Structure 1
Amino acid sequence: LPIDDLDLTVRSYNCLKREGVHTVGELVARTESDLLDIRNFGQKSIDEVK
């Protein structure tokens, strides 16, 4: 499933589509620590992803 299908807000889509994350399969493959590593990552994005 793509991350857009999760019907989320501005920042998470922006910071994901620049770097080529297209699905939630790679997102569930990546752990919370491996996804929070990104510079200027929103804590609200962390909350919604968790």
Structure 2
Amino acid sequence: PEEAIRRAATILAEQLEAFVDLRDVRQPEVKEEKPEFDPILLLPVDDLELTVRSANCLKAEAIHYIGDLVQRTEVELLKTPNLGKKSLTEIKDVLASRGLSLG
């Protein structure tokens, strides 16, 4: 269920002809949003730029946010689900380009 969600649920894009402009009449009304900005200590782990469902199976450890990823030094790093290859390999130096670090 950590794979079988992220387009498996957006099948909702096939249930909406009944309700959200049934015809040909998109009207002026907004989407009215949610912003919280770079590089705030609250921002999600996705704000390190990732590699397919690596994003899902990392945030599933409740390490959803960059602020505590700073603890994950190459001595005890693995506690997470899956997260097995390109993600895990070398991103640790571009982590230091938005500006974080380990030690």
Class of the TM-score when normalised by the shorter of the 2 chains: 0.5 to 0.7
1:11-42: per-residue Cα shift (whole Å, max 9, x none)? 32121121211211211122133223545432
Identity %: 60
Moved more, 29-38 or 6-15: 29-38
Q: Is the 2:57–2:82 Cα contact (8 Å) retained in structure 1?
A: no
Larger proportion of helix: 1
Residue 53 of structure 2 corresponds to: 11
Rg larger in structure? 2
Gaps of 5+ in 1: none
Moved more, 38-47 or 10-19: 38-47
Q: Provide the C-alpha distance between the structure 1 equivalents of 2:73 and 2:66, rounded to a whole number of angstroms.
A: 12
> Which residue of the other structure, out of 84, 91, 95, is the alignment partner of 1:42?
84
**What is the TM-score of this pair, normalised by structure 1?**
0.59
Q: CA RMSD in A?
A: 2.2
Gaps of 5+ in 2: 1-42, 93-103
Q: How many matched pairs?
A: 50
Paired residue secondary structure (1:31)? coil
Task: Give the structure, 1 or 2, with the largest relative contact order (CA under 8 Å, sep 6 or more).
Answer: 1
Q: Which runs of 4+ in 1 moved over 3 A?
A: 37-41
